[model samples]
Target chain A: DLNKKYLIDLHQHQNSSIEVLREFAEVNEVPIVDRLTLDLIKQLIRMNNVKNILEIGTAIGYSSMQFASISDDIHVTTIERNETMIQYAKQNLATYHFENQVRIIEGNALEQFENVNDKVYDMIFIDAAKAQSKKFFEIYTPLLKHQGLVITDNVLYHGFVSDIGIVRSRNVRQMVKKVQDYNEWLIKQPGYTTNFLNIDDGLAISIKG
Target chain B: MDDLNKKYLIDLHQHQNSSIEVLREFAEVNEVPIVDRLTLDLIKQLIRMNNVKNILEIGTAIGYSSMQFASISDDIHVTTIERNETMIQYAKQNLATYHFENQVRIIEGNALEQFENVNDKVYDMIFIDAAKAQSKKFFEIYTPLLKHQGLVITDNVLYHGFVSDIGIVRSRNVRQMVKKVQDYNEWLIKQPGYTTNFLNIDDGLAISIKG
Candidate 1:
């Protein structure tokens, strides 16, 4: 209802620079985050005074640049597997003068753990492969600082997740099943607490206890 | 589509300590104006993550939220304000019942007029859930007492979505009140030195971090 529309209407008008990146993603059919989801994480970064962030996926570096835009003090380390998307992400970052703030790693995140820096982060954003959500979490959770939050995007998968029975494609169905399992498992994963917000595309926020 | 997704999310994600479940049930039956489930969950998470030890609340109706905040940690203390005499009594009774009378101090007067009586300690968080129209005034008066990087949270910002659909409201009084709430939202984001973001969960929650 009002939650979905009112703030989104305002966010579009107020965030001209970020919207440029969003428009680029839209024109090129790039998969980025919803506006509401971006705002939610922006609030968290400001609230927790997050300095260093790890992003599992850096499609076009949209979220990475936005996270750094919260402040010059914040730095983002992002990983992306697609070579073309990585080039676009780097270009987009340089255009915005955020290449210095957002460091891009060119490789699949699951295989690039060693490539990531050896330091704890204030937050970890999971926006990568849907089927590998759990594997990614298992790989990067140690990099998260205590009381740091792990944000999972697209858990709802366009709300097709609520009813996996309705899906026809085998690959999509498998991804949905994995997401459902991940949602159930994430909430009960010891030493962390989770809240599934109904914001755009559905978001799962799991905070380390 | 996301609306349907959110409903399923709420059902699956409703988890809490339940130490104060009975008190929350009492609040539900008596119609006390405490924070709703989603907003309460968010606040508890913030307090735990931020290491907040002191809270300043603008409304202490039945002390429901105050006790909820105190339950986040034994070390946490809540200093809340309330104007209604009956509400203060109800709050005191609940606080005594829960053995939190010492943890949550009630300042019994109009919040705007009772600044001199408030505790002089700097608070780590401020919860504003009082008058819908006076949210701006409440923020200005109480925020100075908050520590650096502390949160200033204001609840019920959407007002059943009327703030956005002001033209659709039927009552003149409601429209007037919606205008004030809308104005407060606009003013809060531009509020210097603090960054405010609105979360559309369980009514609405506006979190302003003092940096």
Candidate 2:
């Protein structure tokens, strides 16, 4: 609890603009990256010198703005399947003057990867539909350039993958198990080296060899 | 959690590299201060993603992590420092045993002193795992030698998460060390033209990049 408060304070101080977006997301009941997860993504963007990014989920445009905030030269193409989120993301992107830098494609995430050019993106971020994580990796990983990165969030599914008994709801447990299976499939995927990080909600980063 | 569930969660999604497993076993038997599995995984990801070529590590604890870094890429080289005579000997032997001596250079001296000579050299990454109290000083000194877009990774910044607690500290030494780490973390975030991420992985890792 104290750590969460500490992070809240730190996030406020570092990027106050994010606070507005975060509150907006919360008020409208849309999930987004927490403070710690955003920090890790920002560090990866800066450290890896990521220029072109493909984001699988564009909810409220919180993460896409983060990618653009790192460098003006960065170009983020985010996909949003929900019509409501698509409208919110477009408005947020325009409000932040990231309309030119960030492109939003309104469609189903599973089918959207087919439209993206192959082997073009420097990094691909997967943040939608936990159960579809494996399908996303299978479809979009080929779009990642050699030596590029593919980062997926919420892989731990709130530690349920670590301890599924923590959940009693049937639907939630099924989703958690599907995430666990996706994680299993992810680590064993050939031609890529992956690391499953125990960060906020569990982050999985796979680098193409 | 049941034993079966515990084992399943611990093993699932965990990257089990044989090279790191061997080092972990060695550290366990030798009682060396090696990084946790989470930290090890983080380091490998950073090294590979950045395509890091050279590293300057502040501590050499039996050369466990050094070997891990060296084994990541054939072109990678690590220059590590160790103050303890015993650890230095063991680290050298371990490096030799893994045939990584050619890639990992072990320097026999205290980091606070030996780091001055390295002012002339530049590195793609600087890993600081030495004394906790000198974290701020080590970062200030070696960070300038980091190449543009390089990274400075510091371990054990949380001091077992006691730094966040306001309750009674265990002892004077622990209290002092906690204060030092706390101060270093504050200073780390204030660095200009740099982005710092304080991750709760392992003991706690602070990854700062020189932008």
Candidate 3:
């Protein structure tokens, strides 16, 4: 409830936040734009115009930085449990004056999210370990503002979901099962309308009410 | 009458235009995706060829494609065999609603058996848009049905951009299906009876002209 409004509130907090993000991505050689799909990312930003954004994985900070680019007033808080990935994101985030707006919390998402000073977010983007998606959804769903947006990337796993036999892979089966479960659960959640777009690896966009 | 029909056919070609909005609206209303646009474009091109007349459509789920064909040429009679009764019902209703009752014939039966026993009918074009794994079977049965100068089209062959990348290890079924598709392409091209051209469209459309 408050999270959705908080997200909108963040947009009115700062000025020229987007230009700062552009500088951060450029200075640190963050491979954000190309690795993840540009079209889907930009669409997500343009559609939500997010106020307070939470990112689970800071892989080169491309996505977090991109979200930060959406508005100067909106604050981006990204958490990465992996020290190495966090180090990379810090370099990228530190270069910009507006980096202070992007609070980079270093620790596991579960532990960090529990202590997240704010109760909820307008948008929660989960791009972390594939196996943890189901758990992350279970934890994060309650923390999302009603009508807030949740986008999960790389859920399709190379068309595995379509093929039952192949989807039941020996090594990655657990992770695949979790991804499938997450997708199934997300769509079935009450007061939420979810659609899985046939974009890069697949993207699930859910609006919670 | 013939001259008027010919003029109408010429007019139809200019307006084979339907938007994704139409497809999306249909899917949203029906609560399911009806037809993918890329597949529609590939199908349109296959029928555009003058030599194609008798067409066999394998896996006719709801006849969206059959209607697309009917829009192009009344001379192009399409026999679409679908096994799914629900899909058959929808296809029948959709076709009848669109007034393609004559040009598109919806046959409710197992295409594998139907394609085999159907009175040795030869097709100028064969479009396969059915199950992913059994694409090879569609090819095996339909290749014989295809006229020496026929075109054979397959839909949803490109599952993302993964179809072209060899280094990426695919699942067993996908691996087998991709192998079958790749092998079929190689074998089709080498066949002395037909010279083939494979265009990566919605999925992929393989055009073969008699050698």
Candidate 4:
């Protein structure tokens, strides 16, 4: 675990606003993008010249804000359903003057496809409702640019998805099973190529063909 | 240890290419250093995503990695440097077998000295897999030839997880080698113009993007 410790320490405080938001997420028990997975996506963004992003979860606007801070030219359109989380998200995003870069839609993602139907994104970040991951991908693929990337977070679900039989609760088991099935079906997609990297909390990256 | 699981649950045989596997087996039997499966998969994804076309590799051990990079797309062109004459011959023969002899150019000399012999076209990525201790020098020398936003990917950076703590190795020589790699990682990430992702996958991969 020393290397893991070294990695976490190495990626800390690269941005002042991101550091403050990450700390707030930690103290408030809000699960945003972990530092390592965020680092990977940032690398992909810079390498591939990603400017437009569509996000499924806007938990306090942490990840969307992080994505916006990559460069001044980047913009993020994120959807959030929780009223309380939306309040905190607005306050946080406004604190950094990222109102123009990050636009928040206050509603459920599945029912709100028409909101972003006219827009196309270079990359999509999916981090909400792990049980409905497949539904999210099915609904969102048409809006992705050719050669764009679809990134799904928390696929491993704290290692429970690896062995669903070891769980006690039925609801938790079904959700984990769905995550597992989503991954199985994702790799079998004939049009896109995917990689399952077991980095912090498991991040799956699919390159749209 | 999850490091075991890091290599586990990942199908090592996922990239099933007959031409590449035979060369991989040859490298294994003959004790030549090459990229691991996880590291190989990660780099291949980068190639597909970024549309990497031209690559300059510092090491061409039996042409294991150069061939893999070439197989990604028929449009790819790889130019590699190897000091050992025996390795250069094997690599040349392997590329010819796959009919990639025209795509992959083999420069027969130590990369530290023969980097000037590379082709004139700007490269999309430069892979440094030569002597571990010479990583920083290789990066400084070759990355200037990259197009804007090109990548400089350094392989075997974690050195079997020893770079994190150099004292883990019993042999003094191995410890010294690990120490050099640790110093390189510390130096690579702090450069002002480039941003690095110190990935812990495979034997450790450090990818620095030139700004």
True contacts kept of each: 0.46, 0.50, 0.00, 0.31
Query: Candidate 4, residue A89: CA error in Å?
Result: 1.3
Q: Write the per-residue lDDT of candidate 2 for residues A1-209, one digit (tens) a residue.
A: 56545544544547746457877777878889877888888878777789999988888889998889878899998877888889888888878888988889888877886667643898998853343777877887777889888898887776677777778999888888788777787778788888766766778888898
Q: Could you give candidate 1's per-residue lDDT for residues A16-42 as a string of tens digits?
A: 376677777788788899887888789
Residue B123 shift from truth in candidate 4, angstroms: 1.2
lDDT of 4 by residue, B1-211 (tens): 3553344336422533445766667767888877776677778899998889999988767887888888988999999888888888889888888888878999887667875698487999999852364777888888878987888898877677776674766678777777777778778778888888766766677777888
TM-score per model over all chains: 0.90, 0.92, 0.45, 0.91
All candidates in order of TM-score, best leading: 2, 4, 1, 3
Candidate 3: pairs in clash:
A7-A51, A7-A52, A10-A73, A14-A73, A32-A62, A147-A208
Report, for all candidates in order, the number of backbone clashes.
0, 0, 6, 0
- Residue range with the least summed lDDT across 10 consecutive positions in model 4 chain A: A10-19
Task: Give a tens-digit lDDT track for model 3, residues A1-209.
Answer: 22222212322322233334545566766434322233334434543456887777776565676666656777777877877678767877776444866888887776775566574688888742354776777777687787677777765654454333654457666666666667666656777655453333555566675
Task: At residue B121, give the lDDT of candidate 1.
Answer: 86
Clash pairs, candidate 1, are: none
Off by over 4 Å in 4: A165-172, B1-9, B12-19, B22-30, B166-169
Question: Could you give candidate 4's per-residue lDDT for residues A9-101 as a string of tens digits?
Answer: 666635446667777878889888877778889889888789999998788887888788889999899988889899998998878788999
Q: What is the C-alpha RMSD of each candidate to the true structure, in Å?
A: 2.7, 2.7, 19.1, 2.5
Could you tell me the TM-score of chain B in model 3?
A: 0.73
Q: DockQ for model 2?
A: 0.49
Span of 10 residues, lowest total lDDT, candidate 3 chain A: A1-10
Q: Please give, for residues B1-211, the per-residue lDDT of candidate 1 as tens digits.
A: 5456656676675555556656767777887766776677778888877889999988766787888888877899899888889889998998888889778999988877766776578899998852353777888888888898999988877765566673645788777776777777777777678876676766677787897
Determine which window of 10 residues in candidate 1 chain A has minimal summed lDDT. Answer: A9-18
Instruction: Give every collision pair in model 2.
Output: none
